[PDB]
């Protein structure tokens, strides 16, 4: 659990140009004598927050920007402070992708969007619409071919279709996200996912198709089309398939809307090599020669570095990438992105396999995506009204009947728990000696340990929240009212991270209201 001083360890996904990145590392070593180790572990975006929370992990982590707000919120990333001269070398919108709570939390590398990739020897002109794909598959099947194969195991690849007719993650209006307004189970999301499931039902696609299977089929000339990003072009070049890269098909006359990623490089907050990491990223990697080395291995997309992007922009494949990007949306970096992706991943897989209907699958995904914010609304309101004696007059907003009814229920059962268990609550409050915001921050680890052990039920959830209210009352009394919202956030995090799957299975807070009815 200690990052080694005087070297650099870098993590990057196994679909990216990690051999090219290692070449940049060798150049760094030639100048400095500092060895750079590039690794591409499986599930690195899940491994990183686990290991970094213990003060371990790589010095530098590469991922699309969407994961980084969660990492930064968890205190796992160093703030990035490049000088004006350096900042001005990258496009401003790329810096925007790596800004979280007003601070830069990573270096942007390149802009990624999915495109339609097609075999010109099979399909001289690609389909403009999703709706024509079934007929094209029929035509191709008579030749011993298929129309389309792409990864159905990762929702990144299916999202463009889900979003086309009106699906959305978190609503964006007036230059701001409404994190309360989730668009996973609306008519538009349903229409797109139904189209996908119908392709499967009608044997135009197979629910088991993954990245490797689709890549192999396209590169062997068995399927006429795939959906993939710039990183895939190297292996297609090697295959000698006569390919094009183009705009994704429309659905119901509307563009497919890919979620656009900015490949980014963050520095681990626990690294003792922050200056070496900055030097590597700014003066080795984010140069024309550094990016070229990575790009020659696996293409990056539209790079963040203006000078190199000027050269690459003439490539029609990059132009197509950017056309698809302009039709899509830059991913949020809010901490709830991880949960959104987990929820949608499960929905797509379950709908595609027939384990759930489209309606069932997307209802669950909606609940899972809404879970943190709805839970926080309820728990924050209860803790604060308990502490102050007065309720919050603000409207509940989205799913407001559920929030209101859950709060009403919690008032009843939670007040009962605080009364009946006053002795244990008072004893434990005194033992914990919670005085300030640092002490509140220290609670998460012990709360997880206690709460995650043993049986799962709504009663224990009430105890968790009710003791929170008991602590909040204390905090207010000792003029530490500012600690209550951080406490609420911490409790909510514990609840939703430890009980996610069970909570979704209960219909979330609707289950709670029903469980304690009368
Ligand atoms: C000093 O002994 C007093 C006598 O004790 C009798 C047994 N007895 N009876 C009851 C109802 C509880 C206990 C103590 S053993 C469990 C325990 C609690 C803690 N430790 C270290 N151990 C402290 C760490 C901690 C835990 C939290 C917090 C939640 C909010 C927060 F702001 C801070 C929190 C801080 O939640 C855990 C899940 C909910 N939970 C549960 C549960 O069922 O999960 C129980 C049983 C309790 C008890 C208490 Cl006093 C508080 C919460 C409980
Ligand atoms: O499928 C959900 C997944 O989507 C994105 O991951 C992409 C990544 O951005 C690409 O660079 C490439 O590696 O493919 C991944 C999909 O397998 C999100 O960035 C990620 O957080 C999310 O889990």
Coordinates of C-alpha atoms and ligand atoms in Angstrom, one line a residue:
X1 CA 0.0 0.0 0.0
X2 CA 2.7 2.5 -0.9
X3 CA 3.6 3.9 -4.4
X4 CA 7.3 3.7 -5.1
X5 CA 9.3 7.0 -5.3
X6 CA 11.6 7.5 -8.3
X7 CA 9.8 5.7 -11.1
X8 CA 6.5 6.0 -13.0
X9 CA 3.8 3.3 -13.2
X10 CA 1.1 4.1 -15.8
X11 CA -2.3 2.4 -16.4
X12 CA -4.0 2.6 -19.7
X13 CA -6.8 0.4 -21.3
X14 CA -5.8 -2.6 -23.4
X15 CA -7.5 -1.2 -26.5
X16 CA -5.2 1.8 -26.6
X17 CA -1.7 2.3 -27.9
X18 CA 0.2 1.1 -24.8
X19 CA 3.3 0.0 -26.8
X20 CA 3.5 3.5 -28.3
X21 CA 3.1 4.9 -24.8
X22 CA 5.9 2.7 -23.5
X23 CA 8.1 4.2 -26.4
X24 CA 7.4 7.6 -24.9
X25 CA 8.4 6.2 -21.5
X26 CA 11.7 5.0 -23.0
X27 CA 12.4 8.5 -24.3
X28 CA 11.7 9.8 -20.8
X29 CA 14.1 7.3 -19.3
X30 CA 16.8 8.2 -21.8
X31 CA 16.7 11.8 -20.6
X32 CA 16.1 11.3 -16.9
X33 CA 17.2 7.8 -15.9
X34 CA 13.6 7.3 -14.5
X35 CA 12.0 4.0 -15.6
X36 CA 8.4 4.1 -16.9
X37 CA 6.3 1.0 -16.6
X38 CA 3.1 0.9 -18.7
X39 CA 0.4 -1.7 -17.6
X40 CA -3.0 -2.5 -19.0
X41 CA -4.9 -4.4 -16.3
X42 CA -8.4 -5.8 -16.9
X43 CA -11.2 -3.6 -15.4
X44 CA -8.6 -0.9 -14.6
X45 CA -11.4 1.8 -14.2
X46 CA -12.8 -0.4 -11.4
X47 CA -9.4 -1.4 -9.9
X48 CA -8.1 2.2 -9.8
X49 CA -10.6 3.6 -7.2
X50 CA -10.1 0.5 -5.0
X51 CA -6.3 0.6 -5.0
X52 CA -5.9 4.4 -4.9
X53 CA -8.2 4.6 -1.9
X54 CA -5.5 2.7 0.1
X55 CA -2.7 5.0 -1.2
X56 CA -1.6 2.4 -3.8
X57 CA -2.0 2.1 -7.6
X58 CA -0.3 3.7 -10.6
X59 CA 1.2 7.2 -10.6
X60 CA -0.8 8.0 -13.8
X61 CA -4.2 6.6 -14.9
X62 CA -5.6 6.9 -18.4
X63 CA -9.3 6.7 -19.1
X64 CA -12.1 8.7 -20.8
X65 CA -12.9 11.8 -18.7
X66 CA -16.3 10.5 -17.5
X67 CA -14.8 8.4 -14.7
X68 CA -12.6 11.2 -13.4
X69 CA -15.1 13.3 -11.4
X70 CA -15.9 10.3 -9.3
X71 CA -12.1 9.8 -8.7
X72 CA -11.7 13.5 -7.9
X73 CA -14.7 13.5 -5.5
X74 CA -13.1 10.5 -3.7
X75 CA -9.8 12.5 -3.3
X76 CA -7.9 10.1 -5.6
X77 CA -6.5 12.7 -8.1
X78 CA -4.0 15.5 -7.8
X79 CA -5.0 18.9 -9.1
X80 CA -3.4 19.7 -12.5
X81 CA -1.9 23.3 -12.7
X82 CA -0.2 23.8 -16.1
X83 CA 1.0 27.2 -17.1
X84 CA -0.8 29.4 -19.6
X85 CA 1.7 28.5 -22.3
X86 CA 0.9 24.8 -21.9
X87 CA -2.9 25.3 -21.5
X88 CA -3.0 27.3 -24.7
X89 CA -1.6 24.4 -26.7
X90 CA -4.7 22.3 -26.2
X91 CA -8.3 23.1 -27.3
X92 CA -10.3 24.8 -24.5
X93 CA -13.2 22.3 -24.8
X94 CA -10.8 19.5 -23.9
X95 CA -9.7 21.3 -20.7
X96 CA -13.5 21.7 -20.0
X97 CA -13.9 17.9 -20.0
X98 CA -11.3 17.5 -17.2
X99 CA -12.6 20.3 -15.0
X100 CA -14.4 19.2 -11.8
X101 CA -15.7 21.6 -9.1
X102 CA -13.6 24.4 -10.8
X103 CA -10.3 22.5 -10.7
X104 CA -8.4 20.7 -13.5
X105 CA -8.1 17.0 -12.5
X106 CA -6.4 15.5 -15.5
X107 CA -4.6 16.2 -18.8
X108 CA -6.8 15.8 -21.9
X109 CA -5.2 13.7 -24.6
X110 CA -7.8 13.0 -27.4
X111 CA -11.4 13.1 -28.4
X112 CA -13.1 9.8 -29.1
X113 CA -16.4 9.1 -30.7
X114 CA -17.9 6.0 -32.3
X115 CA -18.5 5.8 -36.0
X116 CA -20.0 3.3 -38.5
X117 CA -17.1 1.3 -40.0
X118 CA -18.1 -0.5 -43.2
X119 CA -16.5 -2.9 -45.7
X120 CA -16.7 -1.2 -49.1
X121 CA -16.3 -4.5 -51.0
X122 CA -19.5 -5.8 -49.4
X123 CA -21.4 -2.5 -49.0
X124 CA -20.3 0.2 -51.4
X125 CA -22.6 2.6 -49.8
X126 CA -23.4 2.4 -46.1
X127 CA -27.0 2.5 -44.9
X128 CA -28.2 6.0 -43.9
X129 CA -30.8 4.5 -41.5
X130 CA -31.0 1.8 -38.8
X131 CA -34.4 0.9 -40.3
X132 CA -32.9 -0.4 -43.6
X133 CA -30.4 -2.8 -41.8
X134 CA -32.8 -5.8 -41.5
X135 CA -33.4 -5.8 -45.3
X136 CA -29.6 -5.4 -45.9
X137 CA -28.9 -8.3 -43.6
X138 CA -31.4 -10.4 -45.6
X139 CA -29.6 -9.5 -48.8
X140 CA -26.1 -10.2 -47.2
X141 CA -27.2 -13.5 -45.6
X142 CA -28.0 -14.8 -49.0
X143 CA -24.3 -14.2 -49.8
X144 CA -23.0 -15.9 -46.7
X145 CA -22.4 -12.6 -44.9
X146 CA -24.1 -10.5 -42.3
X147 CA -24.9 -6.8 -42.1
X148 CA -23.7 -5.7 -38.7
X149 CA -21.8 -6.8 -35.6
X150 CA -20.7 -4.7 -32.7
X151 CA -20.0 -5.1 -29.0
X152 CA -23.4 -5.7 -27.2
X153 CA -21.7 -6.2 -23.7
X154 CA -20.8 -2.5 -23.2
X155 CA -23.5 0.1 -23.2
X156 CA -21.1 2.7 -24.8
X157 CA -21.8 1.0 -28.2
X158 CA -25.6 0.8 -27.9
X159 CA -26.1 4.2 -26.3
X160 CA -26.0 6.1 -29.7
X161 CA -29.2 4.2 -30.7
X162 CA -30.9 4.5 -27.3
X163 CA -30.2 8.3 -27.3
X164 CA -31.3 8.9 -30.9
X165 CA -35.1 9.2 -30.4
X166 CA -34.8 10.9 -26.9
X167 CA -33.0 8.7 -24.4
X168 CA -30.7 10.7 -22.1
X169 CA -28.5 10.2 -19.1
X170 CA -28.8 13.5 -17.2
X171 CA -30.8 16.4 -18.7
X172 CA -28.8 19.4 -19.9
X173 CA -30.5 22.9 -20.2
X174 CA -29.5 26.5 -19.7
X175 CA -25.8 25.5 -19.6
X176 CA -26.3 23.1 -16.6
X177 CA -27.1 19.4 -15.8
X178 CA -30.2 18.6 -13.9
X179 CA -28.9 15.4 -12.1
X180 CA -32.4 14.8 -10.9
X181 CA -33.7 14.5 -14.5
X182 CA -32.7 11.0 -15.9
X183 CA -33.9 9.9 -19.3
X184 CA -33.2 6.1 -19.3
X185 CA -36.9 4.9 -19.3
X186 CA -38.7 7.4 -21.6
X187 CA -40.4 6.6 -24.9
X188 CA -37.3 7.4 -26.9
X189 CA -34.9 5.1 -24.9
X190 CA -37.5 2.4 -25.2
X191 CA -37.9 2.8 -29.0
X192 CA -34.1 2.5 -29.5
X193 CA -33.6 -0.5 -27.2
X194 CA -36.6 -2.2 -28.7
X195 CA -35.1 -1.7 -32.2
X196 CA -31.9 -3.4 -30.9
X197 CA -33.8 -6.3 -29.3
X198 CA -35.8 -6.8 -32.4
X199 CA -32.6 -7.1 -34.5
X200 CA -31.6 -9.9 -32.1
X201 CA -35.1 -11.5 -32.1
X202 CA -35.0 -11.5 -35.9
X203 CA -31.5 -13.1 -36.0
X204 CA -29.7 -10.0 -37.5
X205 CA -27.5 -9.9 -34.4
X206 CA -26.6 -12.2 -31.5
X207 CA -26.9 -11.1 -27.8
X208 CA -23.6 -12.8 -27.0
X209 CA -21.5 -10.7 -29.4
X210 CA -18.7 -8.9 -27.6
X211 CA -15.7 -6.7 -28.6
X212 CA -13.5 -9.5 -29.7
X213 CA -16.2 -11.4 -31.7
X214 CA -17.3 -8.3 -33.6
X215 CA -13.7 -7.2 -34.3
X216 CA -12.8 -10.7 -35.7
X217 CA -15.9 -10.9 -37.9
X218 CA -15.4 -7.5 -39.4
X219 CA -11.6 -7.9 -39.9
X220 CA -12.2 -11.4 -41.5
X221 CA -14.8 -10.0 -44.0
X222 CA -17.7 -12.0 -42.5
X223 CA -19.8 -8.9 -41.5
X224 CA -20.2 -5.8 -43.6
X225 CA -20.3 -3.2 -40.7
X226 CA -19.2 -2.6 -37.2
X227 CA -19.4 0.2 -34.7
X228 CA -16.1 1.2 -33.1
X229 CA -13.7 4.0 -32.2
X230 CA -10.4 5.2 -33.7
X231 CA -8.4 2.7 -31.7
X232 CA -9.8 -0.1 -33.8
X233 CA -8.5 1.2 -37.1
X234 CA -5.0 -0.3 -36.7
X235 CA -6.2 -3.9 -36.6
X236 CA -8.5 -3.1 -39.6
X237 CA -5.5 -1.7 -41.5
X238 CA -3.6 -4.9 -40.7
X239 CA -6.5 -7.0 -42.0
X240 CA -6.5 -5.3 -45.4
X241 CA -10.3 -4.9 -45.4
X242 CA -11.3 -2.1 -47.8
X243 CA -13.0 -0.1 -45.1
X244 CA -14.7 3.3 -44.7
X245 CA -15.5 5.3 -41.6
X246 CA -18.8 7.2 -41.7
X247 CA -21.7 8.8 -39.9
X248 CA -23.8 6.5 -37.8
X249 CA -27.2 5.5 -39.2
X250 CA -30.2 7.6 -38.2
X251 CA -33.1 6.2 -36.1
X252 CA -36.6 7.5 -36.7
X253 CA -35.0 10.2 -38.9
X254 CA -32.8 11.5 -36.0
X255 CA -29.0 11.1 -35.7
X256 CA -27.5 8.5 -33.5
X257 CA -25.9 10.3 -30.6
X258 CA -22.7 8.8 -29.3
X259 CA -21.4 9.7 -25.9
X260 CA -18.1 11.5 -26.6
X261 CA -15.1 10.7 -24.5
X262 CA -11.9 12.7 -23.9
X263 CA -9.1 10.2 -23.2
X264 CA -7.4 11.8 -20.2
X265 CA -4.4 11.3 -17.9
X266 CA -4.8 11.8 -14.1
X267 CA -2.1 11.8 -11.5
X268 CA -2.8 9.7 -8.4
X269 CA -3.2 11.9 -5.3
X270 CA -1.0 9.4 -3.4
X271 CA 1.9 9.5 -5.9
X272 CA 5.3 10.7 -4.5
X273 CA 6.3 11.3 -8.2
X274 CA 3.9 14.1 -9.1
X275 CA 6.6 16.4 -10.6
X276 CA 7.9 13.5 -12.7
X277 CA 4.4 12.7 -13.9
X278 CA 3.7 16.4 -14.9
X279 CA 7.1 16.5 -16.7
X280 CA 6.3 13.2 -18.6
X281 CA 2.7 14.3 -19.5
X282 CA 3.5 17.9 -20.6
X283 CA 7.0 17.6 -22.1
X284 CA 7.0 14.0 -23.5
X285 CA 3.5 12.8 -24.2
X286 CA 1.6 16.0 -25.1
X287 CA 4.0 16.9 -27.9
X288 CA 3.8 16.1 -31.6
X289 CA 6.3 13.3 -31.3
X290 CA 4.8 11.8 -28.2
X291 CA 1.3 11.7 -29.6
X292 CA 2.5 10.4 -32.9
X293 CA 4.2 7.4 -31.1
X294 CA 0.9 6.5 -29.4
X295 CA -1.2 7.3 -32.5
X296 CA 1.0 5.0 -34.8
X297 CA 0.3 2.1 -32.4
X298 CA -3.5 2.7 -32.0
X299 CA -5.1 5.8 -33.4
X300 CA -6.2 8.3 -30.6
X301 CA -8.9 10.2 -32.5
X302 CA -8.9 14.0 -32.6
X303 CA -6.0 14.9 -30.4
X304 CA -6.2 17.7 -27.8
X305 CA -2.9 19.2 -28.9
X306 CA -3.7 21.8 -31.6
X307 CA -0.4 21.5 -33.5
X308 CA -0.8 17.7 -34.1
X309 CA -4.6 17.8 -34.6
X310 CA -4.0 20.2 -37.5
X311 CA -2.0 17.4 -39.3
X312 CA -4.5 14.6 -38.4
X313 CA -7.6 16.6 -39.2
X314 CA -7.2 16.0 -43.0
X315 CA -7.8 12.3 -42.5
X316 CA -11.4 11.5 -43.6
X317 CA -11.7 9.0 -40.8
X318 CA -11.1 11.8 -38.2
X319 CA -13.5 14.0 -40.0
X320 CA -16.1 11.2 -39.7
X321 CA -15.2 10.8 -36.0
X322 CA -15.8 14.5 -35.5
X323 CA -19.1 14.5 -37.4
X324 CA -20.4 11.8 -35.1
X325 CA -19.0 13.7 -32.1
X326 CA -20.9 16.9 -33.1
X327 CA -24.1 14.8 -33.4
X328 CA -23.5 13.3 -29.9
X329 CA -22.9 14.8 -26.5
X330 CA -19.8 15.1 -24.4
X331 CA -20.1 12.8 -21.4
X332 CA -20.7 14.3 -18.0
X333 CA -17.9 13.7 -15.4
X334 CA -20.2 13.8 -12.4
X335 CA -19.6 11.0 -9.8
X336 CA -22.9 9.3 -10.7
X337 CA -21.7 8.3 -14.2
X338 CA -20.3 5.0 -12.9
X339 CA -23.8 4.1 -11.5
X340 CA -25.5 5.2 -14.8
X341 CA -23.2 3.0 -16.8
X342 CA -23.6 0.0 -14.5
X343 CA -27.4 0.4 -14.6
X344 CA -27.6 0.7 -18.5
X345 CA -25.0 -2.1 -19.0
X346 CA -27.3 -4.5 -17.1
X347 CA -30.4 -3.2 -18.8
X348 CA -29.0 -3.8 -22.3
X349 CA -27.6 -7.2 -21.5
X350 CA -30.9 -8.3 -19.8
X351 CA -33.1 -7.0 -22.7
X352 CA -30.8 -8.5 -25.3
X353 CA -30.8 -12.0 -23.6
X354 CA -34.5 -11.9 -22.9
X355 CA -34.0 -12.1 -19.1
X356 CA -36.1 -8.9 -18.9
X357 CA -38.4 -7.1 -21.3
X358 CA -37.3 -3.7 -22.6
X359 CA -39.8 -2.0 -20.2
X360 CA -38.6 -4.0 -17.2
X361 CA -34.9 -3.5 -18.0
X362 CA -35.2 0.3 -18.5
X363 CA -37.4 0.7 -15.4
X364 CA -34.6 -0.9 -13.3
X365 CA -31.9 1.2 -15.0
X366 CA -33.9 4.4 -14.3
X367 CA -34.2 3.4 -10.6
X368 CA -30.5 2.5 -10.4
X369 CA -29.4 5.8 -12.1
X370 CA -31.7 7.9 -9.8
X371 CA -30.8 6.0 -6.6
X372 CA -28.0 8.2 -5.2
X373 CA -29.7 11.6 -5.7
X374 CA -33.1 10.3 -4.5
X375 CA -31.5 8.7 -1.4
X376 CA -29.6 11.9 -0.7
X377 CA -32.7 14.1 -1.0
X378 CA -34.5 11.9 1.6
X379 CA -31.6 11.5 4.0
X380 CA -30.3 15.1 3.8
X381 CA -33.9 16.4 4.5
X382 CA -34.4 14.0 7.4
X383 CA -31.1 14.8 9.1
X384 CA -31.5 18.6 8.7
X385 CA -35.1 18.8 9.8
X386 CA -34.2 16.5 12.8
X387 CA -31.3 18.8 13.7
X388 CA -33.1 22.1 13.3
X389 CA -36.7 21.2 14.2
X390 CA -38.0 22.7 10.9
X391 CA -38.6 21.1 7.5
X392 CA -37.1 22.1 4.1
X393 CA -39.6 24.2 2.2
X394 CA -37.9 23.4 -1.2
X395 CA -39.9 21.3 -3.7
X396 CA -38.9 17.6 -3.9
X397 CA -38.6 17.8 -7.7
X398 CA -38.4 14.6 -9.8
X399 CA -40.1 11.5 -8.4
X400 CA -41.3 13.9 -5.7
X401 CA -44.2 11.7 -4.5
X402 CA -41.8 8.9 -3.7
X403 CA -39.4 11.3 -1.9
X404 CA -42.2 12.9 0.1
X405 CA -43.7 9.5 1.1
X406 CA -40.3 8.1 1.9
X407 CA -39.6 11.1 4.1
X408 CA -43.0 10.7 5.8
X409 CA -42.3 7.0 6.5
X410 CA -38.8 7.7 7.7
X411 CA -40.2 10.3 10.1
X412 CA -42.4 7.6 11.7
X413 CA -40.0 4.7 11.8
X414 CA -36.9 6.7 12.4
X415 CA -38.3 8.7 15.2
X416 CA -39.3 5.3 16.8
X417 CA -35.8 3.9 16.4
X418 CA -34.2 7.0 18.0
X419 CA -36.6 6.7 20.9
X420 CA -36.3 3.0 21.5
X421 CA -32.5 2.9 20.9
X422 CA -31.7 6.2 22.6
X423 CA -29.4 4.3 25.1
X424 CA -27.2 2.7 22.4
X425 CA -27.2 5.9 20.2
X426 CA -26.1 8.1 23.2
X427 CA -23.4 5.6 24.1
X428 CA -22.1 5.3 20.6
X429 CA -22.2 9.0 20.0
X430 CA -20.0 9.6 23.0
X431 CA -17.6 6.8 22.1
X432 CA -17.2 8.1 18.5
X433 CA -16.5 11.7 19.8
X434 CA -17.6 13.4 16.6
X435 CA -16.5 17.1 16.9
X436 CA -16.0 18.5 13.3
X437 CA -15.9 17.8 9.6
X438 CA -12.6 15.8 9.8
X439 CA -14.3 13.4 12.3
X440 CA -17.3 13.1 10.0
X441 CA -15.0 12.2 7.1
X442 CA -13.5 9.5 9.2
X443 CA -16.9 7.7 9.6
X444 CA -17.2 6.2 6.1
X445 CA -14.8 3.2 6.6
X446 CA -16.4 2.1 10.0
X447 CA -20.0 2.7 8.7
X448 CA -19.3 0.4 5.7
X449 CA -17.7 -2.2 7.9
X450 CA -20.7 -2.4 10.3
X451 CA -23.5 -1.9 7.8
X452 CA -22.2 -4.3 5.1
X453 CA -21.8 -7.2 7.6
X454 CA -24.9 -9.3 8.2
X455 CA -28.4 -9.3 6.9
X456 CA -30.0 -6.8 4.5
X457 CA -33.3 -5.3 5.4
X458 CA -35.1 -2.0 5.6
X459 CA -34.9 -1.9 9.4
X460 CA -31.1 -1.7 9.3
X461 CA -31.3 1.0 6.7
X462 CA -33.6 2.9 9.1
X463 CA -31.0 2.4 11.9
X464 CA -28.2 3.8 9.7
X465 CA -30.2 6.9 8.8
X466 CA -31.7 7.3 12.3
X467 CA -28.3 7.3 13.9
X468 CA -27.3 9.9 11.3
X469 CA -30.1 12.1 12.5
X470 CA -29.0 11.5 16.1
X471 CA -25.5 12.7 15.2
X472 CA -26.9 15.6 13.2
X473 CA -28.8 16.8 16.2
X474 CA -25.6 16.8 18.2
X475 CA -23.6 18.6 15.4
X476 CA -26.2 21.4 15.3
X477 CA -26.1 21.8 19.2
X478 CA -22.3 22.2 19.2
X479 CA -22.3 24.8 16.3
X480 CA -21.2 22.3 13.7
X481 CA -24.3 22.6 11.5
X482 CA -22.0 22.8 8.4
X483 CA -21.1 19.1 9.0
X484 CA -24.6 17.8 8.5
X485 CA -24.7 17.9 4.6
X486 CA -21.3 16.1 4.4
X487 CA -22.7 13.5 6.9
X488 CA -25.8 13.0 4.8
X489 CA -23.6 12.6 1.7
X490 CA -21.4 10.0 3.5
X491 CA -24.4 8.0 4.7
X492 CA -26.0 8.1 1.3
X493 CA -22.7 6.9 -0.3
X494 CA -22.5 4.0 2.2
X495 CA -26.1 3.0 1.6
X496 CA -26.1 3.1 -2.2
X497 CA -22.6 1.5 -2.7
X498 CA -23.3 -1.4 -0.3
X499 CA -26.9 -2.1 -1.2
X500 CA -27.3 -1.0 -4.9
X501 CA -28.6 -4.3 -6.3
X502 CA -31.0 -5.0 -3.4
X503 CA -32.4 -1.5 -3.5
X504 CA -33.1 -1.7 -7.2
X505 CA -34.8 -5.1 -6.6
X506 CA -37.1 -3.4 -4.0
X507 CA -38.2 -0.7 -6.5
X508 CA -35.9 1.6 -4.4
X509 CA -37.7 3.9 -2.1
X510 CA -41.1 2.8 -3.3
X511 CA -40.3 -0.5 -1.6
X512 CA -39.5 1.2 1.6
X513 CA -42.8 3.1 1.6
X514 CA -44.7 -0.2 0.9
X515 CA -42.7 -2.2 3.5
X516 CA -43.7 0.2 6.4
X517 CA -47.2 1.0 5.1
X518 CA -49.6 1.1 8.1
Ligands
LIG1 C1 -21.3 1.9 22.6 O1 -22.3 0.9 22.5 C2 -23.6 1.4 22.8 C3 -24.5 0.1 22.9 O2 -24.7 -0.5 21.7 C4 -25.7 -1.5 21.7 C5 -25.7 -2.2 20.4 N1 -26.2 -1.3 19.3 N2 -27.5 -1.2 19.1 C6 -27.7 -0.4 18.0 C7 -29.0 0.1 17.5 C8 -26.3 0.0 17.6 C9 -25.5 -0.7 18.4 C10 -24.0 -0.6 18.4 S1 -23.2 -2.0 17.5 C11 -23.1 -1.3 15.7 C12 -22.1 -0.3 15.6 C13 -22.2 1.1 15.3 C14 -20.9 1.6 15.3 N3 -20.1 0.6 15.6 C15 -18.6 0.7 15.6 N4 -20.8 -0.6 15.7 C16 -20.5 3.0 15.1 C17 -20.0 3.3 13.6 C18 -21.1 4.0 12.9 C19 -22.1 3.1 12.3 C20 -23.2 3.6 11.7 C21 -23.4 5.1 11.6 C22 -24.5 5.6 10.9 C23 -24.7 7.0 10.9 C24 -23.7 7.8 11.4 F1 -23.9 9.2 11.4 C25 -22.6 7.3 12.0 C26 -22.4 5.9 12.1 C27 -21.2 5.3 12.8 O3 -24.2 2.9 11.1 C28 -24.0 1.5 11.2 C29 -25.2 0.8 10.6 C30 -26.5 1.0 11.5 N5 -26.4 0.5 12.8 C31 -26.8 -0.8 13.2 C32 -27.1 -1.8 12.2 O4 -28.0 -2.7 12.4 O5 -26.4 -2.0 11.2 C33 -26.7 -0.9 14.5 C34 -27.0 -2.2 15.3 C35 -26.3 0.4 15.1 C36 -26.1 0.9 16.4 C37 -25.7 2.2 16.5 CL1 -25.4 2.9 18.1 C38 -25.5 3.0 15.4 C39 -25.8 2.5 14.1 C40 -26.1 1.2 13.9
LIG2 O1 -19.7 0.9 -21.8 C1 -19.6 1.8 -20.8 C2 -18.3 2.5 -20.7 O2 -18.2 3.5 -21.8 C3 -17.0 4.2 -21.9 O3 -15.9 3.4 -22.1 C4 -15.4 3.3 -23.4 C5 -14.1 4.2 -23.5 O4 -14.5 5.6 -23.3 C6 -13.4 4.0 -24.8 O5 -12.2 4.7 -24.8 C7 -13.2 2.5 -25.2 O6 -12.3 2.0 -24.3 O7 -14.4 1.8 -24.9 C8 -15.0 1.8 -23.7 C9 -16.3 1.0 -23.8 O8 -16.0 -0.4 -23.6 C10 -16.9 5.0 -20.6 O9 -15.7 5.8 -20.7 C11 -16.8 4.1 -19.4 O10 -16.6 4.8 -18.2 C12 -18.1 3.3 -19.4 O11 -18.0 2.3 -18.3

